[PDB]
RNA sequence: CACGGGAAACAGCAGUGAUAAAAAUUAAGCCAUGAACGAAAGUUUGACUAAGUUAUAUUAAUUAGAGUUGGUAAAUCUCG
RNA sequence: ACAGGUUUGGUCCUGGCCUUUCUAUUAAUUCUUAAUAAAAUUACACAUGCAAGUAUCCGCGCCCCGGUGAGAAUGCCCU
């Protein structure tokens, strides 16, 4: 568990690392502040001209877990439960 | 279910908590149990007077006289409170009872008036 | 409604008959149905007794 | 409640409605308001009976409703 | 749901989002199509990917695929007057399918938001009753209005066991 | 407590400082119980007459912390900084009785505008607003209302002729009650 | 034809002099919050997407209507004596139906007096509340609309609170909807303390109020302390256009004023305090035109 | 008369529509026509057209 | 199923035997709602309203007792 | 499920069982007062009382309400 653990979070991909690769601004959109759009990172040296090619209907792995999650089909009487703080 | 007769009836259900009475005014078949299943719910009449002094009545005007001109029968709770909104006219026992106690009062007097002597 | 395996109740229709038929014979005349006991105010046949204020 | 099959009981048996006591004045007076009254809410009825009868045939043969055939007719084309 | 090659179709999401709704006359829609080709493509791909989303918004319509009958690919809608409707789809790309589709026989967002404007007219704000139709239950409830006195145990004097003991004495 | 009508001020003071430090009030206490998960409600009332009840909550083993609408400083704590919700009891460690204590004070200090929440943007009630209709605006009184006459004509009472008076006296005799004259007019108190 | 606030001269000159601050306009709001979502965008994307949210901010700063203050309504239906002693209470009567306008519904009140009667302005509107309900009313007035709550939360400097607040609770041509707006007003004039309504859907409001009671003052000085002059010459500008006929308006056609001395046109003959106006616009320009 | 509620509800009704006539809205007793109880019913079954 | 036949019916309110680990009043009113009948005053209604009973559950205070203390899992000392 | 205990001399894996949460009945031990809610072993047998009448006669009502879950995979939704 801890091994798997570090090693999980040794393999984060900052913001801008993905900014650098892909040479893009990566945005983000909190729901609270709306539709603006703030800007987190910027791909220093030279930005690209050429739009993300848009994925109608993207191909990822996905968990049956978060997909049953977000249509409501857990009911588990452990899930939900008060628990102390942190 | 079905039933053998019966009408279209407007009248007031009685939903509520022990001393603390509330009415739903209710567009139902006839032969059906009181709070039971209705066709449409029209208004609702507080009975208690709230915080300003006032027994609240609310009345769907439109569906109301779209049932009676469907046909649909009042309870004489619902005529006495149709009138007294002015819908209706006032009916004859509103009335009545009104000058009942008119006399009532009037009697009282007197004998409150005889008992001082 | 409709279920395959339903039964055909026979004696339904039979008693229907029979009750109809039983009502049309022993009809009765309204010579002895509103005969009244004057002394009672009270029907023989229906055993009803009658209104205070049509007596 | 009882059943058409219930008999009654012994003790109401020999006994019939009695008929309250009727103030002569007030009775006719009142008699007077009742059918006043029942006309009243009769030509209301009436009234909404109309009523149900307008908005029923303009929300079916009106003139909207034949707009809305022709021109989604019209557009199928 | 991890298995099949493009999960996200089995999502009830994906399957909400997808927007064409027939008009009331279309009964059947029949798709023909091939296996083979590269003309034959952008059909596949329709079979693959919007059918699923149609048939959810369209749950009374008749979908059926046929494959390999004709050498071309095409639609044919069944109308309720006996009329049918032929759409020939060739080199066209999926989304150009389903954007001629919604064109041809769809609804008007006037249309649809009509009729959900109808269906949000149904629930009337003002109606006492069960949690399930009704915004409240109670009118203990309502601010102004006497307390549920399984909240707040009424003055002695509006309990009817009060009243009872008074006009007994 | 020496504080009383003055709360906030042991939350100024040097003793509390001291003892709580920056953090929050609950922050070192813990819940003992029979197994990983928490049973679903804490304790109900933690002080029964003059028996202090074992390991007491975070408020109620502080007398001097009072719990009030007033003191924002205390309140704050029990409230979420980001989501600006009230924390569940067994979040906390607050006996029942305190929690429900707390969610009524921070109503009030909310309602009082002592604490801050989210307000949000709301549109006017109305489209289009005209006092013209006749429901708003007054209308032109009746011919009945402006002579001062009953409604209807049968409003009032109206003595019966003498001949159906005697019709019903005939008709009702011996089940008959006194005839009854006009009403008064207007009835008094006692 | 007198000018209107919502006639297009008086919209443009306070929207423009509001301001578009993307910042304030969008704030971190205090509701239960989910983790935020990321794409990658070019620059054009990001323009794309700056330009939409600021139509939306255009929507979000849509102004609050600003009416004058509604007739009592007194009007009796009908007089009934005989149901004079009958009830204690009143009988209070709301015609619901959902298609129907909600100035346009017949409420009717049956008093013990026996009077029918139509429903006052307050007892009107609460009754809507209960029967349709609408998020941020409370049906019994709340607590905080008092003076010492309200000088409470002026000391917290809540004010766009206090106006959001008196918006959903009240109605904008009631007595107390214009009561608080006006308090307020007062208050933010009272403290210097304008930029607080800036960007806010509710400048405006405070800016039609503070021309028609002819307090210019701390908001022009305020305006140009904040080194902006185009919103300050909007500003007399729109006093102008609601006072057509005045010494400054008509001197400003005579003396044919650009903007920055159309700005000492109102400072010489009008405004209460010229010192502070011709002393701050003293410093503002020669302080700019050195420094740029 | 129309019952005073209902008189005024068609008032402002009509008022709405940009009817500016003032006469006073009537309720037409003609076909309110009923019959006192002593009057006795017909025991013949209605033929239904 | 109910012509017929067993046979003589509380699965209406109270009750009672039997049976089960399983235990509400053989109670008061039609005053309010609803229903029936009446042209109507009105009458009837164990529906129902208001009460009686019971730690079954919430809540409020006047009320202290139960369980547990090797680990999971909060908490122990001396004897037998 | 945020999980935990338990296989072995010991480790890892696989894999059951149990613990921790919530509700209802019953039982044991304890029990001060109110209010509200709810009242539930039995389609076995039932003493007694009451539960449907109104109305100038005809008529109109009289498992409608109320009871129960015996039966039937019975059925939900929709024509
Ligand atoms: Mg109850
Ligand atoms: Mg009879
Ligand atoms: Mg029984
Ligand atoms: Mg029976
Ligand atoms: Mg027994
Ligand atoms: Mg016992
Ligand atoms: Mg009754
Ligand atoms: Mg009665
Ligand atoms: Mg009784
Ligand atoms: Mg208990
Ligand atoms: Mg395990
Ligand atoms: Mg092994
Ligand atoms: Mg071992
Ligand atoms: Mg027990
Ligand atoms: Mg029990
Ligand atoms: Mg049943
Ligand atoms: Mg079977
Ligand atoms: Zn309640
Ligand atoms: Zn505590």
Same mark, same amino acid.
Request: glycine share 6%; with cysteine; proline share 7%.
């Given at each position: 568990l801890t091994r798997g653990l570090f090693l999980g979070l040794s393999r984060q991909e900052t913001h801008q690392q993905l900014a650098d690769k892909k040479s893009l601004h990566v945005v983000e959109f909190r729901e609270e502040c709306g539709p603006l759009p703030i800007v987190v990172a910027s791909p220093q040296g030279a930005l690209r001209k050429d739009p993300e090619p848009e994925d109608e209907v993207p191909d990822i792995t996905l968990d049956w877990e978060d997909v049953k999650a977000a249509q409501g089909?857990?009911?588990?009487?452990?899930?939900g439960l008060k628990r102390a703080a942190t | 279910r079905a039933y053998r007769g019966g009408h279209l009836t407007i009248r007031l259900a009685l939903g509520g908590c022990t001393n603390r009475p509330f009415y739903r005014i209710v567009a139902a078949h006839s032969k059906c149990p009181r709070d039971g299943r209705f066709v449409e719910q029209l208004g609702s009449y507080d009975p208690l007077p709230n915080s300003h002094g006032e027994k609240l009545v609310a009345l769907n005007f439109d569906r109301i006289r779209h049932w009676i001109g469907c046909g649909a029968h009042l309870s004489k709770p619902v005529e006495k409170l149709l009138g007294l909104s002015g819908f209706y006219p006032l009916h004859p026992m509103m009335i009545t009872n009104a000058e009942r106690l008119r006399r009532k009062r009037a009697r009282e007097v007197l004998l409150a008036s005889q008992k001082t002597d | 409604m409709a279920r395959k395996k339903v039964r055909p109740r026979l004696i339904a229709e039979l008693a229907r008959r029979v009750r109809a038929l039983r009502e049309q014979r022993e009809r009765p005349r309204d010579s002895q149905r509103y005969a009244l006991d004057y002394e009672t105010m009270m029907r023989p046949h229906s055993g009803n007794r009658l209104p205070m204020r049509a007596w | 409640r009882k059943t058409r099959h219930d008999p009654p009981a012994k003790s109401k048996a020999g006994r019939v409605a009695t008929p309250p006591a009727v103030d002569p004045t007030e009775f006719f007076v009142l008699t007077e308001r009742y059918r006043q009254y029942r006309q009243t809410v009769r030509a209301l009825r009436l009234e909404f009976m109309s009523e149900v009868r307008k908005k029923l045939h303009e929300a079916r043969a009106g003139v909207q409703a034949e707009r809305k055939a022709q021109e989604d007719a019209a557009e199928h084309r | 749901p991890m298995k099949g090659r493009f999960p996200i179709r089995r999502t009830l999401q994906y399957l909400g989002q997808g927007d064409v709704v027939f008009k009331d006359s279309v009964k059947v829609m029949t798709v023909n199509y091939n296996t083979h080709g590269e003309l034959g493509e952008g059909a596949r791909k329709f079979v693959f990917f919007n059918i699923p989303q149609i048939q959810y918004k369209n749950p009374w319509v008749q979908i059926t695929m046929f494959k390999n009958m004709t050498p071309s690919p095409f639609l044919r809608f069944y109308l309720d007057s006996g009329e049918q409707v032929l759409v020939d789809v060739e080199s066209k790309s999926n989304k150009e399918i389903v954007e001629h589709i919604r064109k041809i026989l769809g609804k008007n967002e006037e249309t649809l938001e009509k009729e959900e404007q109808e269906k949000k007219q149904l629930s009337h704000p003002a109606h006492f009753g069960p949690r399930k139709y009704c915004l409240?239950?109670?009118?203990?409830?309502?601010?102004g209005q006497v307390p549920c006195p399984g909240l707040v145990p009424l003055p002695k004097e509006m309990t009817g066991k009060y009243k009872a003991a008074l006009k007994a004495t | 407590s020496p504080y009383k009508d003055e709360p906030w001020k042991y939350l100024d003071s040097e003793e509390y400082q001291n003892r709580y430090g920056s953090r929050p009030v609950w922050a070192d206490y813990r819940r003992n119980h029979? !197994? !990983?998960?928490?049973?679903?409600? $804490?304790?109900?009332?933690?002080?029964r007459g003059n028996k202090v009840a074992g390991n007491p909550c975070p408020i109620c083993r502080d007398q001097k912390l009072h719990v009030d609408f007033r003191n924002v400083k205390l309140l704050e704590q029990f409230v979420?900084?980001? $989501? !600006?919700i009230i924390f569940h009891a067994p979040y906390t460690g607050v006996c029942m009785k305190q929690h429900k204590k707390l969610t009524q004070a921070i109503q009030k200090a909310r309602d009082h505008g002592l604490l801050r929440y989210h307000i949000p943007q709301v549109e006017p009630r109305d489209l289009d607003f005209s006092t013209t209709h006749g429901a708003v605006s007054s209308t032109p009184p009746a011919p009945t209302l402006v002579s001062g006459d009953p409604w209807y004509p049968w409003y009032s009472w109206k003595q019966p002729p003498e001949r159906e008076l005697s019709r019903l006296r005939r008709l009702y005799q011996g089940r008959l009650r006194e005839e009854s004259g006009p009403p008064p007019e207007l009835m008094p108190e006692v | 034809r007198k000018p209107t606030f919502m006639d297009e001269e008086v919209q443009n000159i306070l929207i423009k002099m509001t301001g578009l601050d993307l910042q304030k306009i969008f704030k971190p709001a205090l509701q239960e919050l989910k983790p935020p979502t990321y794409k990658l965008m070019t620059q054009a994307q990001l323009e794309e997407a700056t330009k939409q949210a600021v139509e939306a901010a255009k929507v979000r700063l849509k102004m609050p209507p600003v009416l004058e203050e509604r007739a009592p309504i007194n009007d009796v239906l009908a007089e009934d004596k005989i149901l004079e002693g009958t009830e204690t209470a009143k009988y209070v009567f709301t015609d619901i139906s959902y298609s129907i306008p909600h100035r346009e519904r017949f409420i009717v009140v049956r008093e013990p007096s026996g009077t029918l009667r139509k429903a006052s302005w307050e007892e009107r509107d609460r009754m809507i509340q209960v029967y349709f309900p609408r998020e941020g009313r409370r049906i019994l007035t709340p607590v905080i609309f008092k003076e010492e709550n309200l000088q409470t939360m002026y000391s917290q400097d809540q004010h766009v609170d206090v106006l959001n607040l008196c918006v959903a609770q009240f109605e904008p041509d009631s007595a107390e909807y214009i009561k608080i707006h006006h308090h307020t007003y007062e208050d933010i004039d009272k403290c210097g303390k304008y930029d607080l309504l %800036?960007?806010? %859907?509710?400048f405006g409001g405070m800016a039609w109020y503070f021309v028609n009671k002819k307090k210019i003052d701390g908001l022009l000085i305020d305006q140009i302390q904040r080194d902006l002059v185009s919103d300050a010459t909007s500003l007399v500008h729109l006093y102008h256009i609601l006072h057509p006929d005045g010494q400054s308006a008509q001197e400003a056609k005579k003396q044919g004023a650009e903007g920055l001395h159309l700005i000492k046109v109102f400072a010489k003959t009008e405004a209460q305090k010229g010192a502070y106006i011709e002393l701050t616009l003293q410093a503002y320009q020669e302080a700019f035109i050195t420094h740029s | 008369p129309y019952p005073p509620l209902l008189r005024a509800m068609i008032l402002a009704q009509r008022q709405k529509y940009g009817d500016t006539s003032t006469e006073e809205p009537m309720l037409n007793l003609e076909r309110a026509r009923i019959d006192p109880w002593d009057y006795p019913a017909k025991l013949e079954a209605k033929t239904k057209t």
């Amino acid at each position: 568990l801890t091994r798997g653990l570090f090693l999980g979070l040794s393999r984060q991909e900052t913001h801008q690392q993905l900014a650098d690769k892909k040479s893009l601004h990566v945005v983000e959109f909190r729901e609270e502040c709306g539709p603006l759009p703030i800007v987190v990172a910027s791909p220093q040296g030279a930005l690209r001209k050429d739009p993300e090619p848009e994925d109608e209907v993207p191909d990822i792995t996905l968990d049956w877990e978060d997909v049953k999650a977000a249509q409501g089909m857990k009911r588990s009487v452990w899930s939900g439960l008060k628990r102390a703080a942190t | 279910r079905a039933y053998r007769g019966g009408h279209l009836t407007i009248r007031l259900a009685l939903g509520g908590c022990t001393n603390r009475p509330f009415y739903r005014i209710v567009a139902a078949h006839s032969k059906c149990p009181r709070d039971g299943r209705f066709v449409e719910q029209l208004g609702s009449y507080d009975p208690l007077p709230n915080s300003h002094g006032e027994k609240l009545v609310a009345l769907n005007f439109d569906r109301i006289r779209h049932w009676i001109g469907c046909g649909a029968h009042l309870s004489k709770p619902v005529e006495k409170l149709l009138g007294l909104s002015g819908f209706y006219p006032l009916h004859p026992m509103m009335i009545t009872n009104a000058e009942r106690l008119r006399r009532k009062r009037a009697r009282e007097v007197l004998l409150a008036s005889q008992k001082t002597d | 409604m409709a279920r395959k395996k339903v039964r055909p109740r026979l004696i339904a229709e039979l008693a229907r008959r029979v009750r109809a038929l039983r009502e049309q014979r022993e009809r009765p005349r309204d010579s002895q149905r509103y005969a009244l006991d004057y002394e009672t105010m009270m029907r023989p046949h229906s055993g009803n007794r009658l209104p205070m204020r049509a007596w | 409640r009882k059943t058409r099959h219930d008999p009654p009981a012994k003790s109401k048996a020999g006994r019939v409605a009695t008929p309250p006591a009727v103030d002569p004045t007030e009775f006719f007076v009142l008699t007077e308001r009742y059918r006043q009254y029942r006309q009243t809410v009769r030509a209301l009825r009436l009234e909404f009976m109309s009523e149900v009868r307008k908005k029923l045939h303009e929300a079916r043969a009106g003139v909207q409703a034949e707009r809305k055939a022709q021109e989604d007719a019209a557009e199928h084309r | 749901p991890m298995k099949g090659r493009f999960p996200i179709r089995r999502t009830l999401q994906y399957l909400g989002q997808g927007d064409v709704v027939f008009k009331d006359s279309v009964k059947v829609m029949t798709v023909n199509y091939n296996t083979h080709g590269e003309l034959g493509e952008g059909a596949r791909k329709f079979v693959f990917f919007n059918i699923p989303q149609i048939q959810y918004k369209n749950p009374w319509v008749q979908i059926t695929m046929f494959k390999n009958m004709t050498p071309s690919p095409f639609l044919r809608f069944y109308l309720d007057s006996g009329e049918q409707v032929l759409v020939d789809v060739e080199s066209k790309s999926n989304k150009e399918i389903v954007e001629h589709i919604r064109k041809i026989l769809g609804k008007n967002e006037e249309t649809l938001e009509k009729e959900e404007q109808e269906k949000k007219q149904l629930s009337h704000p003002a109606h006492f009753g069960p949690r399930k139709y009704c915004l409240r239950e109670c009118m203990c409830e309502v601010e102004g209005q006497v307390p549920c006195p399984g909240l707040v145990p009424l003055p002695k004097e509006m309990t009817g066991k009060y009243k009872a003991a008074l006009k007994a004495t | 407590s020496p504080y009383k009508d003055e709360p906030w001020k042991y939350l100024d003071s040097e003793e509390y400082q001291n003892r709580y430090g920056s953090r929050p009030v609950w922050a070192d206490y813990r819940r003992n119980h029979k !197994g !990983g998960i928490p049973p679903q409600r $804490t304790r109900k009332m933690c002080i029964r007459g003059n028996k202090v009840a074992g390991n007491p909550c975070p408020i109620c083993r502080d007398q001097k912390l009072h719990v009030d609408f007033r003191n924002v400083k205390l309140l704050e704590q029990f409230v979420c900084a980001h $989501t !600006g919700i009230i924390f569940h009891a067994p979040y906390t460690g607050v006996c029942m009785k305190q929690h429900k204590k707390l969610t009524q004070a921070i109503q009030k200090a909310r309602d009082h505008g002592l604490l801050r929440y989210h307000i949000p943007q709301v549109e006017p009630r109305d489209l289009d607003f005209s006092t013209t209709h006749g429901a708003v605006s007054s209308t032109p009184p009746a011919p009945t209302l402006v002579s001062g006459d009953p409604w209807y004509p049968w409003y009032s009472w109206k003595q019966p002729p003498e001949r159906e008076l005697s019709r019903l006296r005939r008709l009702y005799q011996g089940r008959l009650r006194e005839e009854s004259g006009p009403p008064p007019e207007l009835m008094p108190e006692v | 034809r007198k000018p209107t606030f919502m006639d297009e001269e008086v919209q443009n000159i306070l929207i423009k002099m509001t301001g578009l601050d993307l910042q304030k306009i969008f704030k971190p709001a205090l509701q239960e919050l989910k983790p935020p979502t990321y794409k990658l965008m070019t620059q054009a994307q990001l323009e794309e997407a700056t330009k939409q949210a600021v139509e939306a901010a255009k929507v979000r700063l849509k102004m609050p209507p600003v009416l004058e203050e509604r007739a009592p309504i007194n009007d009796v239906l009908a007089e009934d004596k005989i149901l004079e002693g009958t009830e204690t209470a009143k009988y209070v009567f709301t015609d619901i139906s959902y298609s129907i306008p909600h100035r346009e519904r017949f409420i009717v009140v049956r008093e013990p007096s026996g009077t029918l009667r139509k429903a006052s302005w307050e007892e009107r509107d609460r009754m809507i509340q209960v029967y349709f309900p609408r998020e941020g009313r409370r049906i019994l007035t709340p607590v905080i609309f008092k003076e010492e709550n309200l000088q409470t939360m002026y000391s917290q400097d809540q004010h766009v609170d206090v106006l959001n607040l008196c918006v959903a609770q009240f109605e904008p041509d009631s007595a107390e909807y214009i009561k608080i707006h006006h308090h307020t007003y007062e208050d933010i004039d009272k403290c210097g303390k304008y930029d607080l309504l %800036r960007s806010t %859907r509710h400048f405006g409001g405070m800016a039609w109020y503070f021309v028609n009671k002819k307090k210019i003052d701390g908001l022009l000085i305020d305006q140009i302390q904040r080194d902006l002059v185009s919103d300050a010459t909007s500003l007399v500008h729109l006093y102008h256009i609601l006072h057509p006929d005045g010494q400054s308006a008509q001197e400003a056609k005579k003396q044919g004023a650009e903007g920055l001395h159309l700005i000492k046109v109102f400072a010489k003959t009008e405004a209460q305090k010229g010192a502070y106006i011709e002393l701050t616009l003293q410093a503002y320009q020669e302080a700019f035109i050195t420094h740029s | 008369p129309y019952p005073p509620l209902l008189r005024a509800m068609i008032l402002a009704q009509r008022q709405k529509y940009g009817d500016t006539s003032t006469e006073e809205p009537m309720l037409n007793l003609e076909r309110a026509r009923i019959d006192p109880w002593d009057y006795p019913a017909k025991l013949e079954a209605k033929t239904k057209t």
